[PDB]
Design a protein around this nucleic acid. Structure first.
Ligand code: K
Ligand code: K
Ligand code: K
Ligand code: K
Ligand code: K
Ligand code: MG
Ligand code: MG
Ligand code: MG
Ligand code: MG
Ligand code: MG
Ligand code: MG
Ligand code: MG
Ligand code: MG
Ligand code: MG
Ligand code: MG
Ligand code: MG
Ligand code: MG
Ligand code: MG
Ligand code: MG
Ligand code: MG
Ligand code: MG
Ligand code: MG
Ligand code: MG
Ligand code: MG
Ligand code: MG
Ligand code: MG
Ligand code: MG
Ligand code: MG
Ligand code: MG
Ligand code: MG
Ligand code: MG
Lengths: 41, 152, 26, 46, 181, 97, 124, 205
RNA sequence: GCUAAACCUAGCCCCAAACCCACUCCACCUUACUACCAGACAACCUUAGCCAAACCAUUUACCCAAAUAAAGUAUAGGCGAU
RNA sequence: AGCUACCUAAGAACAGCUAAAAGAGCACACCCGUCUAUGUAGCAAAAUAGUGGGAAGAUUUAUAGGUAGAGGCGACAAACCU
RNA sequence: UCCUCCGCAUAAGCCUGCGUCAGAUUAAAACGAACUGACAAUUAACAGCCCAAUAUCUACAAUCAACCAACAAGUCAUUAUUACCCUCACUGUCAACCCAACACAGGCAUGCUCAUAAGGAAAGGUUAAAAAAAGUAAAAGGAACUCGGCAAAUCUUACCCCGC
C-alpha cells in the first residue's frame, strides 16, 4: 500500500493565509513565509 | 529470377533456363535530357544488364544495341516521430539504347483533353454545394451588418 | 493522480466558496 | 596539443577490430554477442 | 514493342479503367501447365504496364487511374504461382517422398540455438571445403547459462501477457456485468 | 497544482457479494470438525508462506530453501544478495546490542 | 562515430571493399588472368517465352463467372487422376506386377533426368 | 498495407483516409474504448437491415442500416440520430448545413419483425436445409438477410466484358490433363526445346 | 490575462497454475546477413576479494533436493570473531 | 594500440643557395614548440599573432598488422597505453 | 572595391546533407535555404574485383648510369612438360562532405597550379568617451627601465659555467 499526502494544499494555506500582508516573496513562497510567520507569532 | 537458388553450372552442363520469370520492370521518364534512342528503366537489384537485354528481346521483341546500369542510393535521412531513420529503398536504373535506328519518346500518359469529360455529372452533394454558394449573395455594405433574412 | 476522495471533496468546497465570492448571488 | 579527435575512421580497422567474424573467433567474443542478444540490442556488432 | 509498357492510347487520361476479376486458384487449377505458362507472361506484361503507370502518376503528382488493377494482377500472379507449386510439390512427394525441394537439416549453431540449415551447392566435398569447415555447428558449455537466461526472458514475457489478459477480462465484466453467463 | 479539480468516480462497494458474505466460514474447521483439519490448511498463497510467519530475513532464507532450486537465475541472484545484505544489517547494525 | 544501424553495402568502405561486395546479382562467369572476365553462355538464364498468338486467356476474368470451391491439389488426388486408371485397367487385364511400376510413371531415381525434383535442379 | 497501432480508435472515417490520419496520427495514444465482445456468429445486424431506435432524439423511429463498424459495435442508421454540421466551408463562405448521423450501439437498436413492423428479439437458428437464418423470437418468422451493393461496387447483372476480360467459356474450360510431369518438362516438349547435355551431380551441404 | 493546472488509462508487480522449445521464398562464421573450389585450429583445469574479527596475518554464514522438530544441541574455532 | 609508446610489412615527401664530403650551414614545403602578448565557459577541455628549433636524417609521413593492465611500451619524464 | 590564407583532383572518411516543385518550418540576425513533404539523380573506357599443375630458374643495386667514389649492400627477371577455344559480367561514380558535442581561427595523406583562368568578403547602422586589445609615428636623452634589455628596435664585441 503506497500512501501519499493528498491535502498538502490545505496545509500550505494554513501558513500562507497569515503571510498575505507581507512584503516580497515571503508572502507567497512557503519556504520563506513559514519562517516569517513564526517570527510574527 | 530473384529470391531463388540457381542450379550450379559445371563445364559441359545444360543451359540454365527460366520459364516463369519474376523480374518486373517499369519504364520511367528520364529526369534529364537523353539521346533519342535511349530508354530508361528501373529494374530489380539482382537483374543484370545481360538479363534485361534478353528480357526485353524475348518478351517484348525490342531490338537492343546497348544496356548500361547503375545503382541509385535511396535517402536514409528522414526521421519518423521516434527519431528513427526511414530508408527510402535503393533501386537500380538501366539505360537501354535501341538498335536499328529506332527512337523513343516517353508518351504523355495524362492528357488534359482526355481528362476532361464533356458528359455532365449529377452528384447531388456537389451540385447542392455549388448551387448554394452561387445562389446566396454577399453582405451589402449599406446594411451595416443588419440581418437580411427578415422582410421587415 | 493520487488516491482518495476527502482532499478532492475539500478542494471542491473551497472552489465553490471562491466562485460565490467572485460572483455574489443576488 | 588539442585532444578529442582520437577517432580516425577506417572501415578496414573497424571491421577487423570489432566485426562479426572477429567476435566469433574467441569464446569471450561469442559471449559478447550472447550478452547483446539477451539485452535485445539491434546492433550485435560492427 | 515498347508500346506494351503503356495502356491503350485511348485510356490515357481517363479517370477510371474498368477491369475484370483476378484469376482464382480454382479457375487456374483447371488449366494446363502450358496454358499457365502463357498466362504468366500475359499477366507479366499487364503488371509491367501497371507499374509503369503507377510511377508516372507519382512523377506527375496525379492519382493512378484504377489502382485496384495492380492488386488484381498481383493476386492473379500469386494464385498462378501457388497452383504451379502445388503440382510440383505433389509430384515430388509421389516420386521422392521429400516435403521440401531444397535439402536441409536441423542444426545447432555457435549460439546454442536450433536452426534449419538450408544446404548450398558446392563442387567439392564438405570435408575439403575450407570456408565451410570454419563454421561452428555446435555449442560449447559456456552457452548453457545464456540459453537459460533466454528461456527465462521468454517465460517472463509470456507470464505478463497472460496476466494482462485476465486483468482485461475482469475490467470487461465490470463495464458489462451481464456477461456472467 | 497537485490536487485534482474534479471529484473522483464514486466508490461502489457491494458489501454482500459472495466473497464478503462467506468470509470467515470454516475458520473453526478444527474446533468444530474433530480437528481433522487445521485452520492453517485453509490458507492459500506461496508454498513457503502457508501457515508460517517471519521477518524479511527469515522469509528470504525460507524461500531460497523451499523454492530456490526452481527460481529464475536473475531472481535467485537477487535473493542471495538480499540475504547477504540483511544478514549484515540485522547482525551488525542497529541501536541495540 | 561510425553508423552501426545502416545497411552494409558496396557503397561503403575503401576501393577494395567497394569492388568485392555486390547487390545480389548472380554470376555468369569467372575472372581470368589480367582481370579479364569470361562470360559463360550456359550460366546466363535463358528466358523461355511462349508464343501468345491466338491465346484466349486475358489478364482479368469476367465478373459473371460462377464461384467454385477451393480444392488444393494433393499427392493422393494426382495419383488417383493420373496413375490409378492405368493400374486399375491392367489389374482387370490380369497383367500387373511391381516390376512394371516404371510403366505407370514411377521414377525410382531422380538422377539422370534434366529436371530433377529433389534436390531441385531447375529454376521457376 | 495496414498500419494500425494496438489501441487505435476506430471511428466514423475509414482507417487510412485523410480525416482518419489527421485524427489518429502515428503518435496518438488515447485510452482504449471498452467494447463488449460479440462473436462473429452472434452478430445479427447487417447493412440493409431495418431497425428501430430505442434511445435518443429518434427513439421509436425506424430506418435502414447504412454502415456497420464491428470494432465499435456500431450501426449507422441513414437519416436518424442526426445532428447538423457545416460542409464545404471556406474563408468567404459559411458552407452548407447538412444532417450528420451519429453511430448507435447494437443495444440501442432492435431488428423489426417483418410481418408486424415492431421491434423484436431474434435467435440464430438453422433451417431444415441447413442454412443459418435469423428467426423472430416471438413470431418465429425468418428475417431474410438484406441485399446490399457489393463493396467492390460491381452490379454483375450490368457487367459487360472489357477488352482485357476473359470470357466465361474460356475461363472455365478445362485444358489440364493430370500427368506426372512438371511445367518445365511439358513446356520444353511443347516448344520443341532439345537439351541433350546431362546435369552433373553436386554436393549439397 | 498569460505561462500553466487538472485527468485514467497504457501497462506493470507479487503469487498460483502449467515444464520448456520454431517454421514462406532468399541471405547470413569471409569485412555476418556475401549463389559457386584442396581443406584438416578445436571443448574441460580449486574463484577471488570487499567485508567481519573494531588493525591484521589462521579464520569470516551463501539453496543443493521434506515443512516442522531434534538444535543453535553435539561439534569446529588466532577455542577469538564466528 | 583508429590517440599515444615501440615494432613489422610494403609506400611517400624533402624548393633554392653554399659546400659539393657531410646525423654540414643559410633557407621554403613540412615537423617541432624557445620567448612574449592575447585568450582563460576561449575559435580551442592547450588555441591565435609574432618570434623561434630542425628541415638528406637517430628526418617527417599515409596504409595494414603486432605487443594489454599482476601487463604492454619507454634515447627513465615514474613518460605513454582513446 | 578589396582579399587570396588558396584552389582543382585523387585517396581516406562520410552517405543524399543549398538540384526541381510545394510548403514560410529557419541561418546563433534576415522573406536564400544547409529544415520539412514530394519528385529527380551518379550510365565505363577511370577504379575495384584477377591468374591451371608440378618441377626448375633468378651472384653483378639505385642515383640522367655514363665517367667517379662508396656503404648503411639495396623495389621490379625464368625455363621445361602437361592442361586450356571464351569472352566485356559484377561493384564505386551525387554534395557546399571528413576527425574535433557546433555551419568550431584546431586536425587532415598525395598530384597539379607558385599566384592564379580557380576560390573568396575584414565593416548590421551610428557615434568617435574611459579602461582594454593590435598597430604606426615621436623633440632631447639612449637601458637612467627591470629580477633580467622582457617587449620593441637595431642587428653586433668578448668572456665564463654546464653538456662534447
Ligand atoms: K543488529
Ligand atoms: K582496515
Ligand atoms: K595495431
Ligand atoms: K555524406
Ligand atoms: K581551434
Ligand atoms: Mg558502373
Ligand atoms: Mg570523444
Ligand atoms: Mg593516425
Ligand atoms: Mg577488519
Ligand atoms: Mg589501516
Ligand atoms: Mg597503430
Ligand atoms: Mg620495415
Ligand atoms: Mg634540399
Ligand atoms: Mg643538417
Ligand atoms: Mg639548419
Ligand atoms: Mg621516443
Ligand atoms: Mg629521473
Ligand atoms: Mg621523480
Ligand atoms: Mg579498366
Ligand atoms: Mg566527383
Ligand atoms: Mg601532424
Ligand atoms: Mg574568382
Ligand atoms: Mg563581413
Ligand atoms: Mg566582425
Ligand atoms: Mg558594429
Ligand atoms: Mg624619441
Ligand atoms: Mg639599472
Ligand atoms: Mg649598453
Ligand atoms: Mg631602478
Ligand atoms: Mg627580445
Ligand atoms: Mg647537449
Amino acid at each position: 500500500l503506497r500512501n501519499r499526502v493528498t491535502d498538502r494544499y490545505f496545509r500550505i494555506q494554513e501558513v500562507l493565509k497569515h503571510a498575505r500582508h507581507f512584503r516580497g516573496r515571503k508572502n507567497r513562497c512557503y519556504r520563506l513565509a513559514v519562517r516569517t510567520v513564526i517570527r510574527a507569532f | 529470377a530473384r529470391n531463388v537458388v540457381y542450379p550450379l553450372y559445371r563445364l559441359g552442363g545444360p543451359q540454365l533456363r527460366v520459364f516463369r520469370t519474376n523480374f518486373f520492370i517499369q519504364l520511367v521518364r528520364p529526369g534529364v535530357a537523353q539521346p533519342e534512342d535511349t530508354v530508361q528503366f528501373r529494374i530489380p537489384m539482382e537483374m543484370t544488364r545481360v538479363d534485361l537485354r534478353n528480357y526485353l528481346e524475348g518478351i517484348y521483341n525490342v531490338p537492343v544495341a546497348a544496356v548500361r546500369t547503375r545503382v541509385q542510393h535511396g535517402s536514409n535521412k528522414r526521421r519518423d516521430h521516434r527519431n528513427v531513420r526511414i530508408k527510402k529503398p535503393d533501386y537500380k536504373v538501366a539505360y537501354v539504347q535501341l538498335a536499328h535506328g529506332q527512337t523513343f519518346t516517353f508518351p504523355d500518359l495524362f492528357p488534359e483533353k482526355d481528362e476532361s469529360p464533356e458528359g455532365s455529372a449529377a452528384d447531388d452533394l456537389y451540385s447542392m454545394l455549388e448551387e448554394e454558394r452561387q445562389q446566396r449573395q454577399s453582405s451589402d455594405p449599406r446594411r451595416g451588418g443588419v440581418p437580411s433574412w427578415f422582410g421587415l | 493522480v493520487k488516491k482518495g476522495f476527502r482532499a478532492a471533496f475539500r478542494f471542491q468546497k473551497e472552489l465553490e466558496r471562491q466562485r460565490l465570492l467572485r460572483c455574489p448571488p443576488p | 596539443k588539442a585532444r578529442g579527435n582520437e577517432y580516425q575512421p577506417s572501415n578496414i580497422k573497424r571491421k577487423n577490430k570489432h566485426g562479426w567474424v572477429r567476435r566469433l573467433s574467441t569464446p569471450a567474443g561469442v559471449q559478447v554477442i550472447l550478452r547483446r542478444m539477451l539485452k535485445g540490442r539491434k546492433s550485435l556488432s560492427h | 514493342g515498347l508500346e506494351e509498357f503503356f495502356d491503350d492510347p485511348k485510356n490515357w487520361g481517363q479517370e477510371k479503367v474498368k477491369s475484370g476479376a483476378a484469376w482464382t486458384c480454382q479457375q487456374l487449377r483447371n488449366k494446363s501447365n502450358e496454358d499457365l505458362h502463357k498466362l504468366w507472361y500475359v499477366l507479366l506484361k499487364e503488371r509491367n504496364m501497371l507499374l509503369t503507370l503507377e510511377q508516372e502518376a507519382k512523377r506527375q503528382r496525379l492519382p493512378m487511374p484504377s489502382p485496384e488493377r495492380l492488386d488484381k494482377v498481383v493476386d492473379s500472379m500469386d494464385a498462378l504461382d501457388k497452383v504451379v507449386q502445388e503440382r510440383e510439390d505433389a509430384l515430388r512427394l509421389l516420386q521422392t517422398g521429400q516435403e521440401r525441394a531444397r535439402p536441409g537439416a536441423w542444426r545447432r549453431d555457435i549460439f546454442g540455438r536450433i536452426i534449419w540449415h538450408k544446404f548450398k551447392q558446392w563442387v567439392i566435398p564438405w570435408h575439403l571445403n575450407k570456408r565451410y569447415n570454419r563454421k561452428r555447428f555446435f555449442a560449447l558449455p559456456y552457452v548453457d547459462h545464456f540459453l537459460r537466461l533466454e528461456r527465462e526472458k521468454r517465460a517472463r514475457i509470456k507470464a505478463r501477457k497472460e496476466n494482462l489478459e485476465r486483468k482485461k477480462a475482469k475490467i470487461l465484466l465490470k463495464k458489462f456485468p451481464h456477461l456472467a453467463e | 497544482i497537485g490536487i485534482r479539480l474534479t471529484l473522483p468516480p464514486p466508490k461502489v462497494v457491494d458489501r454482500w457479494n459472495e466473497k464478503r458474505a462467506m468470509f470467515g466460514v470454516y475458520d473453526n474447521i478444527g474446533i468444530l470438525g474433530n480437528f481433522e483439519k487445521h485452520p492453517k490448511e485453509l490458507i492459500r498463497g506461496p508454498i513457503w508462506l502457508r501457515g508460517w510467519k517471519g521477518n524479511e530475513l527469515q522469509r528470504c532464507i525460507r524461500k531460497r530453501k523451499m523454492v530456490g532450486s526452481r527460481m529464475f537465475a536473475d531472481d535467485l541472484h537477487n535473493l542471495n544478495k538480499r540475504i547477504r545484505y540483511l544478514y549484515k544489517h540485522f547482525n551488525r547494525h542497529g541501536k541495540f546490542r | 562515430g561510425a553508423d552501426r544501424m545502416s545497411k552494409w553495402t558496396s557503397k561503403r568502405g575503401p576501393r577494395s571493399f567497394r569492388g568485392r561486395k555486390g547487390r545480389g546479382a548472380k554470376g555468369i562467369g569467372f575472372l581470368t588472368s589480367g582481370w579479364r572476365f569470361v562470360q559463360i553462355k550456359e550460366m546466363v538464364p535463358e528466358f523461355v517465352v511462349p508464343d501468345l498468338t491466338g491465346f484466349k486467356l486475358k489478364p482479368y476474368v469476367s465478373y459473371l463467372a460462377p464461384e467454385s470451391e477451393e480444392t488444393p491439389l494433393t499427392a493422393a488426388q494426382l495419383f488417383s487422376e493420373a496413375v490409378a486408371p492405368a493400374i486399375e485397367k491392367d489389374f482387370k487385364d490380369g497383367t500387373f506386377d511391381p516390376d512394371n511400376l516404371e510403366k505407370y510413371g514411377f521414377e525410382p531415381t531422380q538422377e539422370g533426368k534434366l529436371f530433377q525434383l529433389y534436390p531441385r535442379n531447375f529454376l521457376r | 498495407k495496414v498500419t494500425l497501432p494496438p489501441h487505435y480508435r476506430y471511428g466514423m472515417s475509414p482507417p487510412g483516409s485523410v480525416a482518419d490520419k489527421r485524427k489518429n496520427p502515428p503518435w496518438i495514444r488515447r485510452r482504449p474504448v471498452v467494447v463488449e465482445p460479440i462473436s462473429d456468429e452472434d452478430w445479427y445486424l447487417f447493412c440493409g437491415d431495418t431497425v428501430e431506435i430505442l434511445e435518443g432524439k429518434d427513439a421509436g423511429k425506424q430506418g435502414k442500416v447504412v454502415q456497420v463498424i464491428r470494432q465499435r459495435n456500431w450501426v449507422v442508421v441513414g437519416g436518424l440520430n442526426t445532428h447538423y454540421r457545416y460542409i464545404g466551408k471556406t474563408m468567404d463562405y459559411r458552407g452548407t448545413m447538412i444532417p450528420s448521423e451519429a453511430p448507435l450501439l447494437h443495444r440501442q437498436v432492435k431488428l423489426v419483425d417483418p410481418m408486424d413492423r415492431k421491434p423484436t428479439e431474434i435467435e440464430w437458428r438453422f433451417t431444415e436445409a441447413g442454412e443459418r437464418v435469423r428467426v423472430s423470437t416471438r413470431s418465429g418468422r425468418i428475417i431474410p438477410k438484406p441485399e446490399f451493393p457489393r463493396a467492390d461496387g460491381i452490379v454483375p447483372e450490368t457487367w459487360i466484358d472489357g477488352p482485357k476480360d476473359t470470357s466465361v467459356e474460356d475461363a472455365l474450360e478445362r485444358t489440364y490433363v493430370p500427368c506426372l510431369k512438371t511445367l518445365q518438362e511439358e513446356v520444353m516438349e511443347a516448344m520443341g526445346i532439345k537439351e541433350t547435355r546431362k546435369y552433373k551431380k553436386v554436393y549439397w551441404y
